[PDB]
Amino acid sequence: GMRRGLVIVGHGSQLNHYREVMELHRKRIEESGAFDEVKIAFAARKRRPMPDEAIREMNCDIIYVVPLFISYGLHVTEDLPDLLGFPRGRGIKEGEFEGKKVVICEPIGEDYFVTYAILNSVFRIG
Template sequence: MSALVIVAHGSHLNPDSSTPTHDHADTIRAVEAFDEVRTGFWKEEPSFREVLRTVDSDEVYAVPLFVSEGYFTEQVIPRELRLAGWDPEAWDSDGTSATHVTLTAEDTGQTVHYCGPVGTHDSMTDVIVRRAESVTGDSDVGAGFGLCVVGHGTKRNENSAKAIEYHARRVEAMDRFDEVRALFMDEDPEIDDVTDYFETDDVVVVPLFIADGFHTQEDIPEDMGLTDDYRTGWDTPATVDGRRIWYAGAVGTEPLMADVVLERAADAGADVGRAIDQIREETRQTDAAAGD
């Protein structure tokens, strides 16, 4: 038997923080890629420390639903899962290239394939593009549009910006959008000045955050000038400085994120069969239906 455990931050203050995690777990359960699918959280139950005890399987694929490599993926999660012999150097990563390492959980004896975060996986680029399609209702969106990938950014952890810049470069290489930029909340270049960085009349803004919360639903819309007060909402698109801003909300809420979770597990050796293709097909149909 094998199990998938999706580990995410969660929140004591925002009840919607864990919703994407549960939604993606449900999507993966439905395709029956694993005998068990469980979720564990830092700020909700079951906790990182207890989640392996909810799993009957001896083999576990643990996938962090986090944007970047850093404190949580390198210290908190391995410590709380009690992964014997863990060392961040085992990933041999440059900040965006963590894959997986196989260790043993000290207290349960389970074999744990500990994976890199979803936010740095190459498939996340596809999710960002899908997010742009979803918010515009156009599966061919690109020509005449700019795309802005937004991250938190922090001077305390350079890897926070690396993931954002990595995917911006990958989208740019597709030659699909007229312009692609990476902007940040807490470092330069800042999202406050989004219209200064684009010449296109239409700009899709996709925040590389796992869940919608304080930053994506309050800070970023107000910082961009979509609204003076997030409580009154904003138009989609909203006109700012003569440009139309299509604000997509957190990338982690996109149904295709379930595919990235499965890709991480598959890279670590999980036999997921056709589940990846199935999820891509089903989420495409869901998005098409939502646009009708």
Template sequence: MKTGIILLTHGSRLPEAQITLHHLKELVAQESSYDVVEGASLQFNQPDLPAALATMAARGMKRVVVVPLFLSQGVHMKEDIPEILAREKARYPHMDIVMTGNIGAHRKLAEIIMERIREVSDQHAINY
């Protein structure tokens, strides 16, 4: 089954946010065997979620997995994203659109946090 992945961020007015999403998209594409990996933003940037889903439909995806890159279960996770997905599911009934859980508090995220702390701790030790 042709499957596409959409990495969904909040979006930002700063262009650097799009660069980060692009890098994440490349990393996920390299680590997976999905047919298409795209990025989308909930606000401020294009493609937004409806545009990314339109691209998936145009590329013949039968299943699309939306991965919200959000830390907490806020309004976007509980209301905004599900509302958008409900509208888009009606628009593309031939496409199975599912959403994963948010990133949340995960052991691997804690490992990244500790790595970042060590980076500045090592820099601090070198500066003295």
């Protein structure tokens, strides 16, 4: 019967446009219907919600956690897994949090879609 959620995870920036860009993706994805619930969270102290707080609040059966990061920085290999009780390091990680299935995905930076975002900053199609 699986309800599927997505948590998009950023860093500690409190620049207003950073928050607005995270929300822009979250809203676009929510509207798409690709998932049952889409939330943003931050892998940083004194920011809210943190990824553990966001997953606790979500009633989905399986939750994918995507690091909105260009590179494998310490937020991705250490902080985000520590906060969720998951193994440190790189790669996809499957596990549980409070009975919920959770899959921590890879950061987005090496995707061909980031290569194409770079080209589209020039081409401006769409």
